[PDB]
Amino acid sequence: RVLKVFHYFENSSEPTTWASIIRHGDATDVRGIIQKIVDCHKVKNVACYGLRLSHLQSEEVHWLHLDMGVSNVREKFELAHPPEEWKYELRIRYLPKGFLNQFTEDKPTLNFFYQQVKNDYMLEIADQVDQEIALKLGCLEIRRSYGEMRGNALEKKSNYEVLEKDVGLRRFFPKSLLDSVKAKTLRKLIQQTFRQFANLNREESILKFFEILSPVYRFDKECFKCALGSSWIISVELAIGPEEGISYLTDKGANPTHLADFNQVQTIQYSNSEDKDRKGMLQLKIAGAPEPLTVTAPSLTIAENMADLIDGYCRLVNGATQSFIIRPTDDYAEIIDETRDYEIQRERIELGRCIGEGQFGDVHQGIYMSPENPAMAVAIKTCKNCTSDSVREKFLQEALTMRQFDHPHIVKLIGVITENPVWIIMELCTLGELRSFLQVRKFSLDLASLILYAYQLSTALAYLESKRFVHRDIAARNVLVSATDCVKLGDFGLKLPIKWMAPESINFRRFTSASDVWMFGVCMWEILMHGVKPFQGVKNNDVIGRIENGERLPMPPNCPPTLYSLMTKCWAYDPSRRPRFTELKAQLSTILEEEKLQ
Ligand SMILES: CN[C@@H]1C[C@H]2O[C@@](C)([C@@H]1OC)n1c3ccccc3c3c4c(c5c6c(n2c5c31)CCCC6)C(=O)NC4
């Protein structure tokens, strides 16, 4: 059987669903699980990660000791409540002494840690933190998250808006702040506190983040109210952490008193309050001290959680692998990840000459003989590492989307072959890629033709808008020519094409219809420029630089100055001032009719 573990390693997905799915074995212990997830992310500080299980509708928490066997941990807890309501989440619990410093030379771990701490901050105290503090914090998460954007970006109404109204400032700030200040002024406050963190890369952001939190949120330890002693039980707060070891403080803030270091800890033992109540009993034998250090915790659970803490630490301080808690092949651990009419038998396909390359698989020419009906020329997108299953599942995911579309300027899906290697069968656009097509025919195509193509493209992009489908890569490279008077739209699958991208795409990784329109502008230029690439001989940074300053692509010779202004309307920095697709359709329609009559 399997297991889902939520963790804090980044993904362009939503943070609340970052997880790994492990096909564990029957004697597999929590070590196995942790090991295989962190090896899977190139983690150097393995000894610092633990596993914490908690029910959804409950606020209490269960630390799963390394040596426990998963299936009989399922067994135990899944006998209380269903697997649907339990949350297994990987956490850092065991800080080395220089921890922050040390995690700098372990990039995944610092990132994991930062996220895990940032999550808690939002969830636990963000609402009731100082106004200046919240502000300062939020900005660094902008700064860190959106690496490739230049500093002065947030002093642009459109940019800020994209954060306000598309991204959600809630991703950076508590509902408490956003509510209690007028939004137009909030815009200032951010632009302002953002100045101080203008030129800070991802690494420094994270540390400046921590630096500003630490004074107002201890994440460098855990505390437990509990009682010390074996007979005259006396009430204390325990602090357990890297620069203090086990410490009692009481009180108030003041100096914490040292009790032992983790390297002193001989053995751990815990048990149910054999006495009247329900309390946790915890015993620690220490260096040469003949009497065990005896802790009474409010519940057996807390006791267990405290043992996990102390074990983890010991097992870390000593370069140790086995436990310090005295007790009363199949451990395989694989990493995995989570219908059709239109089936075609492979024997009904003659696989012709390879026609285009794939970073994923080649595209081929082909004959398709369908029993009822004559032969048909088809394109065939092939798969190379097709046996590796999710790569397969993502490949023929593309075919699923193409099922949905039916429009005369989108390349029609014809079928799939759902056995390795997976094949996607589509129509073949005989006259090839548009760029090539244009260069070749630079002197035999009337203008009415060139803009006809943009018109047809726009009808397609309109159709796609109408189904809320963003394409992400509109360019003449993704257009094919199916006949003299007819072009079609290309890829629909999953080294950035900087020069065609809208600014918010280069800045905030945002991809909307409105980003699509910008690219379509550049596409339109390419067409009118008979298949030349935008910005020949300019490297990408000067381009983002020029785009940022106001420079645009010049009017191609022969472009009706109306159409050229439409292109620049598509190149509106603020994505909301850009035309709609349904609108560029209507316009080009007329701009064509006018061109037809000459
Ligand atoms: C960079 N442009 C390539 C031109 C070439 O190969 C590619 C990879 C690319 O076309 C999107 N290609 C596809 C890629 C992904 C899905 C479908 C196609 C595809 C298709 C065709 C095609 C053709 C060419 N290329 C084609 C195609 C070169 C000239 C012959 C026609 C085609 O006719 N139907 C799908």
XYZ file of C-alpha atoms and ligand atoms in Angstrom:
633
model
C 0.000 0.000 0.000
C 0.926 3.691 -0.459
C 1.314 6.947 1.480
C 0.974 10.667 0.819
C 3.412 12.964 2.623
C 3.072 16.762 2.407
C 6.355 18.661 2.440
C 7.919 22.071 1.911
C 9.924 21.654 -1.315
C 8.822 24.186 -3.956
C 6.797 23.613 -7.126
C 4.891 25.938 -9.477
C 1.839 24.243 -7.918
C -0.136 25.662 -4.971
C 1.804 25.336 -1.653
C -0.935 23.360 0.203
C -0.481 20.519 -2.324
C 3.248 19.974 -2.318
C 3.593 16.245 -1.613
C 5.259 12.957 -2.550
C 3.535 9.601 -3.039
C 5.513 6.590 -1.823
C 4.894 2.932 -2.607
C 6.355 1.652 0.679
C 6.867 -1.951 1.828
C 5.531 -3.954 4.766
C 8.571 -3.747 7.087
C 9.483 -0.216 5.965
C 10.283 2.078 8.900
C 9.885 5.882 9.059
C 13.609 6.161 8.305
C 13.083 4.607 4.873
C 10.337 7.098 4.026
C 12.276 10.182 5.131
C 15.488 8.936 3.499
C 13.887 8.394 0.085
C 12.045 11.750 -0.011
C 15.091 13.851 0.899
C 17.468 11.863 -1.350
C 14.914 12.716 -3.980
C 15.628 16.397 -3.477
C 19.427 16.229 -3.093
C 19.325 17.090 0.635
C 22.649 17.043 2.510
C 21.214 17.475 6.022
C 19.175 14.283 6.251
C 19.452 13.967 10.058
C 17.315 17.103 10.600
C 14.052 15.957 9.055
C 11.223 14.208 10.934
C 7.707 12.951 10.160
C 4.666 14.515 11.822
C 1.166 13.079 11.520
C -1.914 15.080 12.474
C -5.686 14.682 12.084
C -7.326 17.438 10.064
C -10.069 18.634 12.438
C -7.700 18.252 15.427
C -4.927 20.621 16.477
C -2.822 17.964 18.264
C 0.133 16.267 16.664
C 1.988 12.941 16.424
C 5.715 12.542 15.833
C 6.462 9.174 14.242
C 9.680 7.809 15.763
C 12.227 6.829 13.044
C 12.168 3.152 13.937
C 8.378 2.650 13.578
C 7.056 0.487 10.717
C 4.687 2.458 8.416
C 2.092 -0.274 7.850
C 1.686 -0.819 11.588
C 1.469 2.952 12.057
C -1.275 3.027 9.486
C -2.604 -0.015 11.390
C -2.664 1.945 14.660
C -4.016 5.342 13.602
C -6.200 4.118 10.755
C -8.020 2.090 13.397
C -9.012 5.423 15.019
C -10.020 7.472 11.951
C -9.996 6.970 8.133
C -6.840 7.675 6.004
C -8.801 10.510 4.298
C -8.545 12.770 7.424
C -4.894 12.124 8.440
C -2.046 14.408 7.330
C 1.480 13.074 7.053
C 3.848 16.001 6.726
C 7.651 15.983 6.526
C 9.271 18.621 8.776
C 12.605 19.839 10.042
C 12.689 19.229 13.809
C 16.363 18.789 14.662
C 18.438 21.886 14.243
C 22.235 21.640 14.203
C 24.076 24.282 16.237
C 24.946 26.645 13.356
C 21.694 25.671 11.653
C 20.912 28.737 9.446
C 24.559 29.178 8.550
C 24.848 25.453 7.800
C 21.715 25.315 5.618
C 23.284 27.954 3.347
C 25.560 25.217 2.057
C 22.548 22.959 1.538
C 20.188 24.841 -0.789
C 17.166 22.511 -0.631
C 17.229 22.440 3.169
C 17.364 26.207 3.620
C 14.464 26.418 1.193
C 12.531 23.646 2.894
C 13.203 25.261 6.242
C 12.293 28.765 5.112
C 8.948 27.519 3.729
C 8.157 25.473 6.811
C 8.861 28.479 9.067
C 7.083 30.955 6.704
C 4.041 28.699 6.659
C 3.894 28.693 10.474
C 4.367 32.436 10.678
C 1.309 33.017 8.465
C -0.720 30.370 10.233
C 0.205 31.159 13.827
C 1.123 34.786 14.544
C 1.148 36.829 11.289
C -2.289 38.266 12.028
C -1.085 39.724 15.352
C 2.425 40.906 14.383
C 3.622 44.527 14.063
C 2.597 46.475 10.965
C 6.174 47.351 9.978
C 7.150 43.699 10.621
C 4.455 42.129 8.440
C 5.260 44.598 5.653
C 8.996 43.924 5.834
C 8.387 40.199 5.789
C 5.859 40.040 2.934
C 8.162 42.039 0.614
C 11.086 39.618 0.969
C 8.790 36.784 -0.137
C 7.928 38.872 -3.210
C 11.627 39.609 -3.639
C 12.636 35.967 -3.286
C 9.710 34.415 -5.174
C 9.923 36.605 -8.247
C 13.656 36.396 -8.844
C 13.898 37.596 -12.435
C 12.033 40.920 -12.012
C 13.998 44.164 -11.623
C 13.613 46.209 -8.434
C 11.623 49.199 -9.655
C 8.773 46.949 -10.860
C 6.423 47.463 -7.918
C 6.375 51.216 -8.585
C 4.223 50.414 -11.656
C 0.406 50.468 -11.246
C -0.070 47.473 -13.579
C 2.562 45.314 -11.858
C 1.230 45.943 -8.390
C -2.281 45.298 -9.734
C -1.221 41.875 -11.057
C -0.203 41.108 -7.473
C -3.343 42.629 -5.920
C -5.898 41.122 -8.216
C -4.448 38.075 -10.035
C -1.904 36.633 -7.583
C -3.545 37.739 -4.337
C -1.560 39.640 -1.737
C -2.935 37.038 0.687
C -0.011 34.926 -0.668
C 2.306 37.392 1.127
C 0.234 39.106 3.812
C -2.304 38.351 6.577
C -6.013 39.118 6.178
C -5.559 41.389 9.230
C -3.281 43.858 7.405
C -5.092 43.871 4.058
C -8.410 44.593 5.781
C -7.325 47.344 8.185
C -5.751 49.771 5.680
C -7.147 51.474 2.546
C -5.839 49.636 -0.516
C -4.505 52.640 -2.498
C -2.347 53.555 0.523
C -1.351 49.906 0.984
C 0.148 50.188 -2.518
C 2.450 52.927 -1.221
C 3.440 51.093 1.969
C 4.634 48.134 -0.099
C 6.490 50.079 -2.839
C 8.215 51.850 0.043
C 9.265 48.934 2.274
C 10.255 47.135 -0.902
C 12.948 49.691 -1.658
C 15.121 48.427 1.213
C 15.191 44.913 -0.297
C 15.546 45.997 -3.959
C 18.826 44.257 -4.882
C 18.740 41.036 -2.835
C 18.988 37.620 -4.488
C 16.998 34.580 -3.270
C 19.592 33.543 -0.662
C 19.880 36.917 1.117
C 16.110 37.393 1.071
C 15.642 34.180 3.050
C 18.194 35.179 5.651
C 16.910 38.734 5.922
C 13.507 37.086 6.271
C 14.661 34.955 9.211
C 16.645 37.816 10.718
C 13.495 39.964 10.917
C 11.297 37.157 12.299
C 13.573 35.650 15.014
C 13.257 38.592 17.497
C 9.444 38.235 17.425
C 8.950 34.485 16.837
C 11.082 31.732 18.268
C 11.548 29.023 15.614
C 14.936 28.052 17.058
C 13.405 25.711 19.670
C 10.334 24.025 21.072
C 8.817 24.557 24.528
C 6.651 22.422 26.836
C 4.971 23.309 30.103
C 5.522 20.210 32.244
C 6.792 19.074 35.664
C 10.307 18.044 36.723
C 11.405 15.578 39.387
C 10.698 12.055 40.580
C 8.809 12.828 43.798
C 8.529 16.462 44.710
C 7.191 17.265 41.251
C 7.883 20.903 40.428
C 6.382 22.907 37.582
C 8.529 24.305 34.741
C 8.642 25.258 31.107
C 11.095 23.208 29.111
C 12.981 24.629 26.167
C 14.607 22.073 23.866
C 16.957 23.367 21.139
C 20.438 23.484 19.505
C 22.092 26.319 21.573
C 20.940 25.366 25.076
C 20.189 21.634 24.939
C 17.519 20.768 27.476
C 16.719 23.869 29.517
C 14.196 24.969 32.113
C 13.156 28.571 32.279
C 10.782 29.978 34.920
C 10.905 32.858 34.604
C 9.626 35.236 33.337
C 11.494 35.754 30.154
C 14.915 36.150 31.832
C 17.778 33.624 31.723
C 17.063 30.022 30.719
C 18.805 27.534 33.047
C 20.774 24.671 31.484
C 19.890 21.056 32.351
C 21.880 18.828 29.992
C 23.328 18.629 26.504
C 22.009 16.055 24.014
C 25.469 14.457 23.845
C 25.091 13.664 27.550
C 21.923 11.700 27.068
C 22.448 8.028 27.649
C 18.899 6.643 27.133
C 15.246 7.596 26.702
C 12.162 5.829 28.051
C 8.558 6.963 28.268
C 5.339 5.465 29.566
C 1.734 6.089 30.465
C 1.118 7.737 33.876
C 0.853 4.558 35.907
C -0.606 6.946 38.517
C -4.244 8.129 38.650
C -4.377 10.570 35.679
C -3.301 10.156 32.014
C -0.068 12.161 32.057
C 3.057 11.286 30.116
C 6.019 9.951 32.043
C 9.443 10.577 30.520
C 12.825 9.397 31.823
C 16.280 10.492 30.709
C 19.446 8.834 31.970
C 22.295 11.361 31.720
C 26.135 11.501 31.878
C 27.242 10.001 35.185
C 24.285 11.394 37.110
C 22.993 8.202 38.768
C 19.293 9.264 38.916
C 17.182 9.609 35.739
C 15.905 13.086 34.890
C 12.165 12.619 35.275
C 9.605 14.616 33.284
C 5.843 14.584 33.686
C 3.970 15.801 30.644
C 0.231 16.704 30.524
C -0.521 13.798 28.144
C 1.050 10.578 26.904
C 1.100 12.224 23.528
C 3.218 15.192 24.575
C 5.543 12.706 26.318
C 5.928 10.785 23.008
C 6.489 14.048 21.141
C 9.178 15.085 23.613
C 10.932 11.726 23.299
C 10.954 12.132 19.524
C 12.523 15.530 19.966
C 15.252 14.360 22.289
C 16.012 11.188 20.309
C 16.266 13.145 17.053
C 18.742 15.465 18.694
C 20.911 12.705 20.217
C 20.878 10.749 16.988
C 22.080 13.945 15.317
C 24.690 15.182 17.834
C 26.309 11.741 17.722
C 26.745 10.550 14.123
C 24.185 7.883 14.918
C 21.609 5.846 12.981
C 19.790 3.725 15.580
C 17.523 5.063 18.360
C 18.200 6.067 21.969
C 14.759 5.033 23.154
C 14.730 1.722 25.054
C 11.929 -0.554 23.742
C 9.147 -1.923 26.134
C 13.803 -8.059 1.305
C 10.594 -5.970 1.201
C 11.265 -2.505 2.731
C 11.296 -1.275 -0.873
C 10.292 2.408 -1.062
C 9.469 3.667 -4.559
C 8.697 7.281 -5.480
C 5.653 7.504 -7.756
C 3.159 10.217 -8.735
C -0.650 9.902 -9.025
C -10.557 7.235 -21.427
C -11.047 7.244 -25.217
C -13.096 6.636 -28.292
C -10.440 7.914 -30.821
C -8.221 4.817 -30.512
C -6.186 3.836 -33.541
C -4.434 0.525 -34.141
C -0.766 0.910 -34.918
C -1.030 -1.624 -37.759
C -3.210 0.943 -39.521
C -0.375 3.483 -39.669
C 2.473 3.606 -42.215
C 5.172 5.647 -40.443
C 6.862 7.906 -43.013
C 9.862 10.242 -42.910
C 10.561 12.147 -39.690
C 9.417 15.781 -40.281
C 10.143 17.668 -37.019
C 12.164 17.253 -33.816
C 10.891 16.933 -30.256
C 12.681 17.763 -27.009
C 10.314 14.951 -25.925
C 9.708 13.106 -29.191
C 9.993 13.335 -32.953
C 7.118 14.134 -35.296
C 6.700 11.998 -38.399
C 4.764 11.960 -41.641
C 2.312 9.087 -42.182
C -0.395 7.204 -44.045
C -3.458 6.193 -42.045
C -5.659 3.542 -43.625
C -9.017 3.385 -41.823
C -10.886 0.132 -42.740
C -14.034 2.033 -43.694
C -12.609 4.992 -45.725
C -9.633 5.840 -48.014
C -6.022 6.474 -46.957
C -5.109 9.757 -45.256
C -1.899 11.730 -44.787
C -1.277 12.303 -41.077
C 1.274 13.700 -38.637
C 2.521 11.411 -35.862
C 4.066 12.680 -32.668
C 6.293 9.968 -31.205
C 7.488 9.237 -27.681
C 11.053 8.211 -26.663
C 11.144 7.534 -22.889
C 7.532 6.318 -23.142
C 7.980 3.397 -20.726
C 8.545 5.775 -17.731
C 4.865 6.090 -16.756
C 4.054 9.686 -15.738
C 6.091 10.929 -18.732
C 3.669 8.766 -20.711
C 0.666 10.124 -18.779
C 1.741 13.706 -19.438
C 2.401 12.993 -23.104
C -1.096 11.683 -23.932
C -2.460 14.405 -21.630
C -1.820 16.699 -24.612
C -4.092 14.518 -26.782
C -6.832 14.866 -24.172
C -6.903 18.629 -24.531
C -6.882 18.470 -28.351
C -10.023 16.309 -28.148
C -11.861 19.403 -26.844
C -11.070 21.722 -29.735
C -12.818 21.720 -33.101
C -12.098 24.787 -35.222
C -10.684 25.175 -38.735
C -7.413 26.941 -37.744
C -6.347 24.640 -34.943
C -4.519 21.445 -35.923
C -7.118 18.678 -35.664
C -6.445 15.632 -33.409
C -7.170 12.437 -35.303
C -6.465 9.747 -32.670
C -4.013 8.161 -30.255
C -2.253 4.845 -29.763
C -2.254 4.305 -26.040
C 0.393 1.555 -25.822
C 4.166 2.216 -25.564
C 5.501 4.012 -27.431
C 2.541 6.336 -27.252
C 1.629 7.946 -30.608
C -0.605 10.983 -31.179
C -2.155 11.118 -34.611
C -3.153 14.472 -36.071
C -3.728 16.040 -39.482
C -0.729 16.954 -41.604
C -0.239 20.529 -42.695
C 1.310 19.788 -46.096
C 2.888 23.199 -46.810
C 4.905 23.249 -43.573
C 6.020 25.756 -40.945
C 4.905 29.341 -41.477
C 8.275 31.061 -41.113
C 9.931 28.894 -43.784
C 6.756 29.252 -45.844
C 7.009 33.035 -45.792
C 10.755 33.488 -46.409
C 10.464 31.258 -49.495
C 7.443 33.174 -50.833
C 8.622 36.664 -49.821
C 7.877 38.028 -53.328
C 4.775 36.099 -54.467
C 2.335 36.872 -51.637
C 0.083 39.905 -51.765
C -0.404 41.777 -48.475
C -4.049 40.579 -48.378
C -2.587 37.090 -47.831
C -0.193 38.020 -45.022
C -2.943 39.632 -42.975
C -5.390 36.859 -43.920
C -3.146 34.604 -41.863
C -3.255 36.848 -38.774
C -7.016 36.976 -39.206
C -7.315 33.167 -39.226
C -4.959 32.882 -36.273
C -7.066 35.382 -34.312
C -10.250 33.408 -34.957
C -8.489 30.429 -33.396
C -7.181 32.365 -30.450
C -10.692 33.765 -29.960
C -12.079 30.235 -29.953
C -9.471 29.260 -27.352
C -10.314 32.248 -25.151
C -13.945 31.190 -25.286
C -12.876 27.924 -23.603
C -10.526 29.677 -21.148
C -7.479 27.965 -22.718
C -4.129 29.780 -22.437
C -1.567 28.674 -25.019
C 1.612 30.185 -23.486
C 3.701 30.093 -26.701
C 2.259 31.966 -29.697
C 4.834 32.430 -32.438
C 5.288 31.750 -36.113
C 7.303 28.635 -35.140
C 4.079 27.104 -33.830
C 2.073 27.793 -36.967
C 1.750 25.408 -39.884
C 0.372 26.003 -43.358
C -2.237 23.505 -44.522
C -2.926 25.274 -47.815
C -2.224 28.499 -49.737
C -5.273 30.231 -48.174
C -5.151 28.498 -44.760
C -2.972 28.288 -41.627
C -3.359 26.383 -38.322
C -2.279 26.590 -34.676
C 0.340 24.238 -33.300
C 1.669 22.536 -30.223
C -0.585 22.341 -27.052
C 2.058 20.514 -24.909
C 3.309 20.971 -21.288
C 15.041 27.648 -22.413
C 12.411 30.437 -22.298
C 11.211 32.224 -25.489
C 11.989 35.581 -23.848
C 11.658 37.788 -26.940
C 7.972 36.867 -27.516
C 6.907 37.025 -23.876
C 4.719 39.609 -22.181
C 6.463 41.474 -19.330
C 4.277 40.015 -16.586
C 5.323 36.576 -17.880
C 9.001 37.433 -17.512
C 8.256 39.131 -14.171
C 5.564 37.181 -12.333
C 5.504 33.920 -14.275
C 1.880 34.837 -15.037
C 0.211 33.417 -18.139
C -3.223 34.681 -19.109
C -5.100 35.272 -22.352
C -3.741 38.833 -21.948
C -0.170 37.467 -22.039
C -1.219 35.468 -25.099
C -2.277 38.706 -26.915
C 1.135 40.294 -26.479
C 2.829 37.273 -28.099
C 0.211 37.323 -30.860
C 1.338 40.889 -31.490
C 4.904 39.705 -32.013
C 3.497 36.882 -34.081
C 1.674 39.391 -36.289
C 4.944 41.317 -36.690
C 6.806 38.139 -37.710
C 4.159 37.489 -40.336
C 4.364 40.988 -41.806
C 8.170 40.719 -41.601
C 7.986 37.636 -43.858
C 9.295 35.238 -41.206
C 12.171 37.140 -39.609
C 12.708 36.742 -35.856
C 12.061 39.722 -33.562
C 15.281 41.274 -32.240
C 17.921 39.579 -34.348
C 21.329 39.956 -32.682
C 20.030 41.211 -29.354
C 20.627 39.196 -26.191
C 17.616 38.813 -23.905
C 18.531 41.276 -21.109
C 18.835 44.268 -23.428
C 15.440 43.227 -24.809
C 13.684 43.101 -21.408
C 15.561 46.368 -20.774
C 14.240 48.050 -23.924
C 10.712 46.668 -23.467
C 10.949 48.116 -19.960
C 12.060 51.560 -21.200
C 9.423 51.998 -23.928
C 11.124 50.624 -27.063
C 8.937 48.444 -29.278
C 9.313 46.498 -32.512
C 9.366 48.902 -35.502
C 6.714 49.012 -38.220
C 7.542 46.436 -40.902
C 7.751 48.001 -44.373
C 4.308 47.799 -45.977
C 2.198 47.502 -42.816
C -1.096 49.467 -42.950
C -0.474 52.000 -40.170
C -3.830 51.044 -38.643
C -2.768 47.404 -38.164
C 0.645 48.500 -36.814
C -1.115 50.519 -34.098
C -3.145 47.400 -33.266
C 0.193 45.577 -32.789
C 1.257 48.261 -30.282
C -2.160 48.045 -28.606
C -1.264 44.384 -28.034
C 2.044 45.590 -26.602
C 0.445 47.601 -23.752
C 2.551 47.065 -20.585
C -0.532 47.024 -18.392
C -2.120 43.750 -19.585
C -5.661 45.133 -19.039
C -5.234 47.876 -21.668
C -4.488 45.150 -24.224
C -7.185 44.208 -26.729
C -9.307 41.116 -26.215
C -8.996 38.240 -28.715
C -12.652 38.583 -29.749
C -11.781 42.236 -30.545
C -8.601 41.730 -32.609
C -10.750 39.291 -34.554
C -13.403 41.924 -35.410
C -10.734 44.543 -36.245
C -8.615 42.311 -38.531
C -11.841 41.242 -40.173
C -12.382 44.849 -41.336
C -8.668 45.637 -41.812
C -8.743 42.664 -44.200
C -11.919 43.541 -46.125
C -10.383 46.974 -46.687
C -7.187 45.323 -47.899
C -9.085 42.962 -50.221
C -10.624 45.861 -52.162
C -7.090 47.407 -52.171
C 8.972 24.315 -34.584
N 7.883 23.909 -35.559
C 7.841 22.409 -35.861
C 7.591 22.086 -37.375
C 7.422 20.566 -37.654
O 7.585 19.850 -36.427
C 6.862 20.293 -35.255
C 7.552 19.758 -33.996
C 6.755 21.810 -34.992
O 5.404 22.337 -35.409
C 4.607 22.878 -34.274
N 5.480 19.836 -35.375
C 4.708 19.530 -34.331
C 5.001 19.582 -32.932
C 4.083 19.238 -31.933
C 2.832 18.837 -32.337
C 2.532 18.787 -33.730
C 3.452 19.129 -34.741
C 3.449 19.179 -36.132
C 2.479 18.899 -37.104
C 2.805 19.063 -38.417
C 4.084 19.504 -38.824
C 4.727 19.766 -40.031
C 6.036 20.174 -39.718
N 6.182 20.182 -38.391
C 5.047 19.789 -37.844
C 4.755 19.643 -36.485
C 7.109 20.555 -40.728
C 6.472 20.663 -42.148
C 5.446 19.432 -42.350
C 4.205 19.647 -41.450
C 1.583 18.702 -39.064
O 1.454 18.762 -40.278
N 0.569 18.359 -38.188
C 1.070 18.423 -36.809
